[PDB]
Amino acid sequence: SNANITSQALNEFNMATRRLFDPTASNTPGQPNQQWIKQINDASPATVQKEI
Amino acid sequence: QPADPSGQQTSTNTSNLVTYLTNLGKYLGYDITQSSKAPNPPYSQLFNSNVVQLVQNYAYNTFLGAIPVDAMSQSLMNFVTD
Amino acid sequence: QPADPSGQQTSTNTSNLVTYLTNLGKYLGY
């Protein structure tokens, strides 16, 4: 029902490659789940430290 | 009326307080004077716990399952005994 | 009786501290 597929190389890939560019991310401002750097651009200091 | 110097002293102190808290908020990199430029509503949690948790447990599972292992009987592919 | 300007100045100043501390806490993300 929620059967989803990944390999270990592809999964380690998208674990590494999720913050810098993201295919699922919205590339137009004003939409949710934007690029991680743009989300950081408005993030709070506590938020960014949790990211660290 | 005879003005009490304590009131004037406290007024100057409070003006000094607002000035200096403006200065420190300035130094932290924010503009404190206007509430509109402040975020609304606030956020302290991370962007999305769900996507990151999903990614991390998936990576953990894929690493456990990916590596080849002796497969001839269940007790012999065992990773940890008890 | 006429009000001393020190009291009104301090009341306005206190409203500014309240507003500005809420703004700073907002900027921290709280």
Side-chain angles (χ1 to χ4, degrees):
Chain A
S1 85
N2 281 119
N4 59 347
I5 280 308
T6 184
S7 93
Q8 145 81 126
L10 168 141
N11 180 333
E12 158 285 335
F13 171 73
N14 52 37
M15 150 287 302
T17 67
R18 154 290 320 290
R19 293 157 334 290
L20 163 77
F21 164 76
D22 176 32
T24 34
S26 305
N27 265 112
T28 290
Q31 324 169 282
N33 78 349
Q34 278 165 126
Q35 283 300 330
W36 153 267
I37 74 153
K38 295 146 41 197
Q39 256 164 78
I40 287 298
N41 211 5
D42 320 323
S44 315
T47 299
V48 300
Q49 207 200 149
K50 302 210 178 158
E51 329 316 297
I52 328 305
Chain B
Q1 75 258 11
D4 256 318
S6 306
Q8 341 291 327
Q9 182 272 6
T10 46
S11 83
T12 59
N13 274 0
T14 58
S15 42
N16 156 281
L17 271 293
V18 282
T19 301
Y20 286 181
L21 54 61
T22 304
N23 305 324
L24 61 93
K26 209 52 163 78
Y27 263 111
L28 276 296
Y30 315 132
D31 174 36
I32 298 311
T33 73
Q34 299 300 317
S35 195
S36 45
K37 271 154 272 154
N40 181 36
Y43 212 50
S44 65
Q45 303 136 357
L46 84 173
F47 293 127
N48 192 348
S49 91
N50 298 326
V51 295
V52 54
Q53 68 202 71
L54 161 151
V55 165
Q56 51 87 0
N57 326 101
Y58 291 0
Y60 148 88
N61 291 325
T62 49
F63 141 72
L64 327 178
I67 56 135
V69 52
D70 281 12
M72 45 306 301
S73 98
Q74 160 55 29
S75 82
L76 305 168
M77 51 214 78
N78 276 9
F79 227 139
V80 46
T81 63
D82 76 323
Chain C
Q1 184 79 352
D4 208 43
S6 322
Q8 288 82 240
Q9 193 270 13
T10 46
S11 77
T12 58
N13 266 352
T14 47
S15 38
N16 321 109
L17 305 313
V18 152
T19 310
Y20 284 3
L21 62 84
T22 59
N23 313 139
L24 72 83
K26 209 58 159 77
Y27 267 101
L28 275 310
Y30 305 63

